[PDB]
């Protein structure tokens, strides 16, 4: 009968330690707050969003303030090809003389980090040149974070609290965001490219002190109204042009060169601007157009579960398109920085997609009404529900037996001294597509390997001018634009498919079995996350919808891991110009053990040793740190509540019976973590361990050999 926790009234009467844990676990779980109403819920969400908004801005301000103060951007802009970007200083009192001596690196005198987020390459392209331009963004974001905070506070006050109808006006939000949020922002970013970014890449300084005076083009805005848009197709930059300075600089602000800049190996600024200007137009027009709509509007989980499903899709795209299409100068050449950005965003994509299906299952338990959803599209998947899972179950089984089978087949015959007996399947359907995209390496000789096809010529309106720049790049093996593939790429791609199929099955089944099955017809009555249904009826562990999300988090990490494992190993050879090592060893699993894990861990594992230490001791310590916390998760997942609760009782007895200690007492009675709690806590250790093992290895292995 204590005041804490406020949001959960029932928890507040629990006299044990469970109260504190669950009071944290049910705090921001607003849908089960005591005495809550729908109108208060929506107004609270809006304000909560501002807090997140402020944090992202502060984070980027923290990404700005520390670089301007302790980084080396001004030093970096001068010759990016050898300077290591500095994240921030190292102020750790436990450091010794020899640890300061090792991390005083990147040409610094005090210890600092070597940054790998790529913000230096991104900010350069955007037009930032000096540390003081950095200092402006952090200060500006500080106000914007406080302005979002004030606004969140503002829209919670009586006179400014919105009504319910405003929050549920779905069509207007899409219209206003593709109008505003998408339309106006993309068009303006083309403007920031042409009014700021492009001049600075051509040696011309444009700042607040002069931006109103210097125009982006010699005689612009007289052709603009008269329809003579073609004047902006004036003289681009020559192949001899040196990025960031005026030796070879042109005057174009809108182009369609295609390919990559020969020096930077990244997109043309003028090319990025036209793309954003064009997409902007598309969203502004579509944003002026406005039974399932009555269902997607009343469930906050359905909207979010699609919003993560949209976020999860485009997060994967960001990883796929940034490694093959580098958009920032020299970002293709900073290989560790190429490695961190791909892995990071791919893991995020896995969480959102898994999360999308997780919140979908919550919708099915608390909001899906069988009688307001009848004879529509939603309830017709529930109709043949047993069919979808059963077929999906088969494909996973099918994929697994054969994909593992081919790898083991190759391994054995290779183990016996006979590599020629391996089963190596050429990715001919894939090799078709690159050849259809213009890659004349595989020689399939149709569709822009065909020099006369109507696609390459485009006899309609003489449009196709991305083609020269593109064809040069697709045949040169100096980038990652449609990388060469062989037997290794075939097997992994089917493994990834196997990973995508097994991960999707559990998440779809979890949502589809959330409301009920034969083993548990009334599952919906117990809510989303509950322990089980006892040892009766054969046993019911891991029967809750939450547990399905929980098991799937193990499968996604494996899937997203295999993708990042594949992407990493392949890139090692290309960056070291010896693609042959990977091509022959990646078709059997011992190669991934000998030439990928063991081989690339040589330096990382020697970050410190009995003879000294180097600048990789953190990564070496973190690697071991990750292994420990990964393994710590196994403890909570294998040993369950009962064992611990009985163990705790002997400690409670011992404390109360020990003089000089008996005198003091706990306020909350000690109890073991809950059944669901342990799964989450175990998985959290496991997953953090999964990443911080991979983060330590990925960064350290590449930073030592380049």
């Amino acid at each position: 009968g204590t005041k804490f926790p406020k949001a959960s009234q029932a928890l507040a009467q629990d006299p044990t330690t469970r109260r504190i844990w669950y009071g944290i676990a049910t705090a921001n779980d607003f849908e089960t707050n005591d005495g809550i109403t729908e109108e208060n819920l929506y107004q609270k969400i809006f304000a909560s969003h501002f807090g997140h908004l402020a944090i992202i801005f502060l984070w980027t301000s923290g990404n700005l303030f520390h670089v301007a103060w302790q980084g080396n951007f001004e030093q970096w802009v001068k010759d990016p090809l050898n300077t290591r970007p500095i994240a921030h200083a190292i102020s750790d009192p436990h450091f010794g003389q020899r640890a300061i001596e090792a991390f005083s690196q990147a040409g610094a005198s005090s210890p600092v980090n070597i940054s790998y987020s790529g913000v230096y390459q991104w900010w350069y392209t955007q037009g930032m040149r000096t540390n003081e331009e950095l200092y402006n963004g952090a200060i500006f974001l500080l106000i914007l974070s406080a302005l979002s905070l004030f606004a969140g506070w503002l829209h919670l006050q009586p006179k400014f609290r919105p009504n319910l109808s405003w929050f549920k006006n779905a069509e207007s939000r899409l219209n206003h965001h593709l109008g505003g949020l998408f339309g106006t922002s993309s068009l303006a970013w083309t403007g920031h490219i042409v009014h700021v970014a492009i001049p600075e890449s051509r040696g011309q300084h444009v700042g607040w002190d002069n931006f109103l005076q210097v125009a982006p083009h010699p005689a612009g805005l007289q052709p603009f109204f008269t329809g003579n848009w073609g004047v902006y197709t004036e003289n681009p930059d020559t192949a001899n042009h040196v990025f960031g300075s005026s030796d070879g600089a042109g005057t174009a602000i809108l182009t369609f060169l295609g390919g990559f800049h020969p020096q930077t190996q990244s997109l043309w600024l003028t090319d990025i601007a036209h793309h954003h200007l064009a997409i902007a137009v598309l969203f502004i027009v579509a944003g002026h157009m406005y039974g399932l709509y009555d269902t997607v509007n009343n469930s906050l989980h359905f909207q979010l579960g699609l919003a993560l499903a949209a976020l999860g899709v485009i997060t994967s795209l960001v990883a796929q398109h940034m490694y093959s299409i580098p958009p920032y100068a020299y970002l293709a050449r900073d290989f560790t920085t190429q490695a961190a950005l791909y892995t990071h965003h791919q893991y995020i994509a896995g969480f959102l997609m898994v999360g999308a299906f997780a919140h979908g299952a919550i919708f099915l338990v608390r909001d899906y009404d069988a009688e307001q959803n009848k004879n529509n599209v939603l309830a017709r998947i529930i109709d043949h529900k047993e069919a979808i899972i059963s077929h999906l179950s088969w494909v996973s089984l099918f994929l697994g037996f054969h994909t593992l089978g081919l790898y083991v087949h190759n391994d054995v015959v290779q183990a016996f001294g006979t590599p020629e007996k391996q089963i190596l399947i050429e990715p001919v359907f894939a090799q078709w597509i690159q050849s259809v995209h213009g890659k004349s390496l595989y020689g399939f000789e149709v569709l822009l390997n065909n020099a006369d096809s109507i696609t390459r010529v485009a006899p309609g309106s003489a449009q196709p001018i991305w083609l020269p720049g593109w064809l040069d790049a697709i045949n040169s093996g100096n980038n990652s634009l449609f990388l060469t593939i062989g037997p290794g790429d075939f097997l992994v791609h089917h493994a990834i498919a196997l990973g995508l199929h097994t991960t999707t099955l559990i998440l779809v089944k979890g949502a589809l079995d959330a409301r009920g099955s034969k083993l548990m017809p009334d599952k919906k009555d117990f809510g989303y996350s509950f322990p089980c249904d006892g040892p009766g009826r054969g046993g019911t562990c891991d029967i809750s919808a939450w547990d399905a999300f929980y098991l799937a988090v193990f499968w996604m990490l494996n899937t997203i891991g295999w993708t990042t494992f594949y992407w990493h190993w392949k890139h090692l050879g290309v960056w070291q110009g010896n693609v042959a090592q990977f091509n022959e060893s990646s078709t059997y699993l011992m190669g991934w053990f000998r030439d990928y894990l063991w081989l690339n861990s040589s330096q990382l594992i020697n970050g410190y040793n009995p003879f000294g230490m180097n600048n990789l001791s953190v990564w070496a310590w973190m690697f071991l740190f990750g292994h420990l916390i990964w393994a710590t998760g196994f403890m909570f997942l294998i040993s369950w509540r009962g064992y611990w609760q009985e163990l705790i009782e002997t400690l409670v007895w011992a404390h109360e019976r020990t003089p000089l200690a008996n005198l003091v007492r706990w306020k909350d009675k000690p109890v073991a973590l809950s059944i669901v709690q342990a799964r989450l806590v175990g998985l959290a250790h496991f997953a953090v361990g999964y990443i911080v093992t991979y983060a330590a290895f990925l960064i350290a292995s590449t930073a030592s050999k380049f």
């Binding site: 109403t37 608390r366 909001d367 009404d369 009334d522 919906k524 009555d525 007895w653 109360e656 019976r657």
Partner: protein, 139 residues
């Protein structure tokens, strides 16, 4: 009535019994009349000895009183085990049998509380009780 005091068995032990939960709130007392001087397993450790009695044992949980008398039913046929809950440092005296007869035997005059006039296949979805203080299985 508990008639305290009553003779405790000849036991002498149990680190596994009756620490500082009891003296602040809610401990227990089973009573029976053992028709021998046999040895029996306690829930704390196991052996005390049953008396002729007026037997009495001060336990810690209502769970612990029940599994004692189920052994008194199975291994010793002592049907007279009468569990309690103590005065001021406990709550409600004489919980079992609350109606004078055994709860596996049916007694009229008891109240059908929790009795539900529907099936569980006829259970509503929480969308018909959403944002409402009604509970999905209530009646």
């Amino acid at each position: 009535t508990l008639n305290l005091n009553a003779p405790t068995p000849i036991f002498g032990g149990s680190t596994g019994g009756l620490l500082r939960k009891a003296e602040v709130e809610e401990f227990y007392s089973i009573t029976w009349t053992g028709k021998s001087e046999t040895v029996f397993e306690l829930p704390t450790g196991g052996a005390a000895i049953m008396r002729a009695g007026e037997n009495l044992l001060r336990l810690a949980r209502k769970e612990q009183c029940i599994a004692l008398g189920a052994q008194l039913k199975d291994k010793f046929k002592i049907t007279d085990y009468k569990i309690y809950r103590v005065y001021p440092s406990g709550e409600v005296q004489f919980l079992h049998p609350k109606d004078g007869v055994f709860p596996e035997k049916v007694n009229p005059g008891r109240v059908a509380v929790g009795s539900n006039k529907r099936r569980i296949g006829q259970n509503p979805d929480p969308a018909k009780l959403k944002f409402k203080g009604q509970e999905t299985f209530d009646s």
